[PDB]
Design a binder for this molecule. Structure first.
Ligand SMILES: Nc1cccc(C(=O)O)c1
Length: 185
């Protein structure tokens, strides 16, 4: 009906533990209170179609695909689950690696973007087709051309050790899990 569901997971399920393990990797002192699997077939189908397209233009390489974090306010959760992340809601300004949506390797970095008035913070785990990346820059509205030739698929803070990714194309992201956690108890 709304085109999506959010399915609360059991903490005894291995699916839960996989998500929790990744969060806990860098926020081990916080307390996960719920994890919901985002179920949106249309966003999944388009993402899988994009991955397929990237595989065809890749020169036989695997498409670089990562589970990355995105901190947001609870107010945006259902919007993201239905329409995907959209960087133009509030816009981008300040320290840019480009005008696109941002994702972090470490949960710990996304904490700062999980605004709350309350003790309960909310963060997404997303499936991101990062592909081939180059360092970002504030003026970028797309990834730049590769040298010669073709374009990069994403931008990062560091080619040698990337921890922040910017995506300019929503078909390269699938919102996977909503993680609710507390900093207290
Ligand atoms: N890495 C990175 C940079 C900026 C915002 C975020 C986020 O979690 O929203 C992540």
């Amino acid at each position: 009906d709304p085109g999506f569901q959010k399915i609360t997971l059991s903490s005894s399920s291995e699916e839960y533990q996989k998500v929790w393990n990744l969060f806990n990797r860098t926020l081990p002192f916080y307390f996960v209170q719920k994890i919901e699997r985002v179920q949106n077939l249309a966003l999944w189908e388009v993402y899988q179609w994009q991955k397929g397209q990237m595989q065809k233009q890749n020169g036989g390489k695997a498409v670089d695909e990562r589970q990355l974090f995105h901190g947001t306010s609870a107010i945006f959760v259902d919007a993201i689950c239905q329409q995907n992340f959209d960087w133009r809601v509030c816009g981008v300004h300040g320290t840019s690696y480009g005008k696109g949506s941002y994702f972090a390797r470490d949960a710990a970095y996304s904490h700062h973007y999980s605004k709350s008035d309350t003790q309960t913070h909310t963060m997404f785990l997303a499936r991101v087709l990062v592909g081939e990346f180059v360092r970002g820059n504030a003026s970028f509205v797309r990834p730049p051309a590769k040298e010669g030739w073709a374009f990069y698929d994403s931008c990062v803070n560091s080619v040698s050790d990337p921890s922040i990714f910017v995506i300019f194309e929503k078909h390269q992201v699938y919102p996977e899990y909503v993680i609710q956690y507390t900093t207290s108890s």
